[PDB]
Amino acid sequence: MKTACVTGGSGYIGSALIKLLLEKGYAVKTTVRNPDDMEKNSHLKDLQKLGPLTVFRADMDEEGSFDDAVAGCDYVFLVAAPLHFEAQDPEKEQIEPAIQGTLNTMRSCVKAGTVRRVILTSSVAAVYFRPDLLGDGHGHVLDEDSWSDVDFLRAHKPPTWSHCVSKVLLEKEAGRFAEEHGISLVTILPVIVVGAAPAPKARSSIVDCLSMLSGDEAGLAMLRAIQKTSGEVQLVHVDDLCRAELFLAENATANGRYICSRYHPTLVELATFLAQKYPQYGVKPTDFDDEERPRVTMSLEKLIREGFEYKHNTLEEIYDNVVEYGKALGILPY
Amino acid sequence: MKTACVTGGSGYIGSALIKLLLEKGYAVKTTVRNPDDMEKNSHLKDLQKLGPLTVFRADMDEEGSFDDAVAGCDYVFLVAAPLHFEAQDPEKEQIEPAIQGTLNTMRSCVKAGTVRRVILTSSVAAVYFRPDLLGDGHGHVLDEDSWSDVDFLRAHKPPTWSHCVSKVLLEKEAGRFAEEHGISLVTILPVIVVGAAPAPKARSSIVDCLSMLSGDEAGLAMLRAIQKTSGEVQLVHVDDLCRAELFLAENATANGRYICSRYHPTLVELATFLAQKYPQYGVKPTDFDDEERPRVTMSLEKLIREGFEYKHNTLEEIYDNVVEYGKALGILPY
Ligand SMILES: NC(=O)c1ccc[n+]([C@@H]2O[C@H](COP(=O)([O-])OP(=O)(O)OC[C@H]3O[C@@H](n4cnc5c(N)ncnc54)[C@H](OP(=O)(O)O)[C@@H]3O)[C@@H](O)[C@H]2O)c1
Ligand SMILES: NC(=O)c1ccc[n+]([C@@H]2O[C@H](COP(=O)([O-])OP(=O)(O)OC[C@H]3O[C@@H](n4cnc5c(N)ncnc54)[C@H](OP(=O)(O)O)[C@@H]3O)[C@@H](O)[C@H]2O)c1
Ligand SMILES: O=C1C[C@@H](c2ccc(O)cc2)Oc2cc(O)cc(O)c21
Ligand SMILES: O=C1C[C@@H](c2ccc(O)cc2)Oc2cc(O)cc(O)c21
């Protein structure tokens, strides 16, 4: 009955969100960059079996190309995002495109006239970078009023700086635009996302949350960096993320931005669990021993306050199906 | 101006509840077993400088003795509770009298005819003892549907068994009674309570949370027992518990039982924080190193879903003032 658009149907979170929407009885429209690439989009034919799913070609770099996909939709889930750290001139190759691609899609929402709410998928990368609070030696609970320090990041350009800046600025810009055109925009801010999805060529979070099993050095360094900063990592099941996105679309009183997170283990806790549950990978939990650090953690309360309920609540439930996904994707060798 | 009764004004939580009630403009009646004991009850004189405070004598074993104190009260906070010392017949000396004493006070609430709500202070001792969830080696999140297993406890009588059975049965019987007599009963279930209160003789109530600084062997054993069971401990600040109790009395939609908890450190996290903030006590965090264990934790969501907010959200804030209190009580030498 109601219709929704999901940008980046070939993506990890995008594919999972399409599945939820179809299961929930939505007509769905999704965009990919090359609808003919079955290497990336073989899942779309399968998803079509669950309900009305229509595929469009669109590129965030190409103005107006989202017009057709967004037309008629009651809800638009802005999931697709450049990402890809690369380097060189991040300001012109990551940040500016990130901002413009977002406004590109926003304008299609205005053109459609039908869009009752836009859900923007951002990231706690736009929340956590508070150099006043990291390194003061105290614990902190960061909430939705916390914004990553764009000025400090541009001045000092630490690792992943363009990523946090991209997210902060595209969120601010989309909110300004939504303000100006009287469109309702809600933003969700996930932590590390765990779990299986329809997408056949995903990597993204799966590499990181599986890095103790694969030994992938980039993912391992990412996990250790988060813990050295926060004293913990933060995790959420992809299906809870998708349900939170739909919750925010459907509940009229939802407003502003929302952290989405459920379980906050130390790496030693996470490695201990993984080594017991999946001994075939040889995880050594002592590889992740660390002194206790003050906790700089994310508040889970806003979604809870507004009535949302997570279904994957223990560490084991958060890891209920990601290993098999990683195997199928070749991220894990067996 | 509404009027509220707190049973057991001499006690740790009771004195803190009275203080909050006066600050929020309530007239307060409280009970002690010997109003003439001004050593034990000096704080009640002090608190009278905040607002109307009236002391009554009453005893849970003495039928009717609470009549005068609850009379004319809008709300009644049932806080008083027996200390519980190893008894030859726990059923006859502890469990049955805990039920009867609770009913005794319930009756006085009915008799008053004015009691909008009764708030029962209990504890997660009535929640956590689950032979399946504790022994199955998996992580779990317990919520307010979880009750300690009275039959298993009577069958195997582990340590503290009588304390849990007492809490479970007295809560069940008080709800039975409240149903039949048409009086609203809400129950709060705190975890370990930390922080300063007005009571001058409350030594025994904060022994555990300071045991790392004091070396109190009984307190250390309790902390380790809980960690052995749950993989962590659970803490809440006494002032958040008091604020939660007031919230549950004042908000008509509140119903049933509520866990009250905020911060769940491992012992090594707790010890590390204490060692650095209060080095003068020679805490050795390595004394508390431990294997990562499946987390059997408490859900914090019910109070949050209903709009309550905690003010002591970091480990440091939860410990913001308890050390000075322990000095004043003589738990800590300096
Ligand atoms: N995964 C996590 O742990 C996590 C955590 C926090 C936040 N998030 C946020 O959630 C969003 C989706 O994350 P993901 O893990 O699903 O990443 P993903 O699998 O790489 O999906 C990203 C999608 O964006 C599309 N895309 C990129 N540039 C495009 C362009 N110019 N035009 C059209 N489409 C374009 C991509 O299509 P192509 O494949 O054709 O390039 C891809 O399908 C991201 O914004 C992420 O930052 C994720
Ligand atoms: N302290 C914590 O960390 C914590 C944590 C979770 C739950 N709780 C629960 O909160 C409740 C209050 O705890 P608390 O720490 O405040 O203990 P407390 O300081 O010992 O206060 C309990 C009060 O009960 C009174 N009392 C005992 N028997 C009585 C009787 N027969 N008649 C009248 N009064 C009687 C006592 O007054 P007398 O001096 O006259 O005996 C005492 O003041 C308890 O049920 C506890 O189980 C406490
Ligand atoms: O954008 C983010 C945020 C990042 C993060 C998590 C926790 C934290 O405290 C800080 C940053 O984790 C991620 C992990 C991914 O695989 C892909 C992502 O896009 C991201
Ligand atoms: O009633 C309880 C329950 C106990 C507890 C906390 C957490 C847990 O997981 C299990 C039991 O903590 C306490 C600590 C006290 O000083 C006094 C108490 O009366 C109690």
In short:
Chains A, B: NADP(+) binds at residues 10, 12-13, 33, 40, 59-61, 81, 167, 193, 204-205. Two copies of one chain form a homodimer. The first copy, chain A, is of the alpha/beta class.
CATH fold naming of chain A:
Rossmann fold
- How many discrete domains of chain A? 1
**Which H/E pattern describes the elements of chain A?**
EHEHEHEHEEHHEEHHHEHEHEHHH
Structural class of chain A: alpha/beta
Beta percentage of chain A is 5-15%
Q: What is the distance, rounded to the nearest whole angstrom, between the alpha carbons of the first and last residues of chain A? A: 42 Å
Keywords (chains A, B): Nucleotide-binding, Oxidoreductase
Organism (chains A, B): Sorghum bicolor (Sorghum)
Protein name (chains A, B): 3-deoxyanthocyanidin synthase
GO molecular function (chains A, B): nucleotide binding; oxidoreductase activity, acting on the CH-OH group of donors, NAD or NADP as acceptor
Question: How is this fold's topology laid out?
Answer:
The structure is a homodimer of 334-residue chains.
Chain A: E1 3-7, H1 12-23, E2 27-32, H2 38-48, E3 53-57, H3 67-70, E4 75-78, H4 90-112, E5 117-121, E6 140-142, H5 150-156, H6 161-180, E7 185-190, E8 192-194, H7 204-209, H8 211-214, H9 217-230, E9 235-237, H10 238-250, E10 256-260, H11 267-277, E11 296-298, H12 301-305, H13 315-318, H14 322-329
Parallel strand pairs in A: 1-2, 1-4, 2-3, 4-5, 5-7, 6-11, 7-10, 8-9
Helix pairs in contact in A: 1-10, 4-6
The complex binds NADP nicotinamide-adenine-dinucleotide phosphate (2 copies) and naringenin (NAR) (2 copies).
The site of one naringenin (NAR) has 11 residues of chain B, from helix 9.
PDB class: oxidoreductase
Keywords: SDR type protein, sorghum, oxidoreductase
Assembly: dimeric
